[PDB]
Design a protein around this nucleic acid. Structure first.
Length: 49
DNA sequence: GACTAGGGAGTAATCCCCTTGGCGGTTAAAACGCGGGGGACAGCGCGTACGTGCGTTTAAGCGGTGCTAGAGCTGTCTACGACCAATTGAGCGGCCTCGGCACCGGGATTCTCCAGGG
């Protein structure tokens, strides 16, 4: 459920976690750069899809 | 006359196709905002084309007339139209194409803007 994602988001911001998201309302190029950035790097902790 | 055999309907189980709602993904149309510029409109001047006063006539209303050819109603008949159905064919109800329409691409053609010099 998409309504769950933001429910997680304000939760994740409550714990000071570094995270990002990917759902069906994201532009294709933004989606590709997001997954490319997540493949590298290590500070970003959780990816919610 | 007593009981026997078989099949479509009565009862019933199988299938299974058909949809009710909700929810997510994704493209297209609608929604919103800015730079700038062209359309709206004021201020004005004028001239010349009507707005208006008065003289001097033709003309509709006036007042009447003597009828004259077209309009309304009186018979009267008779050519014709609204009354059954057999028909039987003119035409519609349902299906099966291939062709013109749908629509997009490569190109020639054409319509428009600018910053300069000419």
């Amino acid at each position: 459920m998409t309504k769950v994602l933001d429910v997680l988001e304000q939760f994740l911001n409550y714990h000071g976690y570094l995270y990002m998201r990917l759902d069906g309302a994201t532009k294709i190029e933004d989606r590709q750069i997001l997954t490319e950035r997540f493949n590298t790097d290590s500070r970003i902790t959780v990816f919610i899809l």
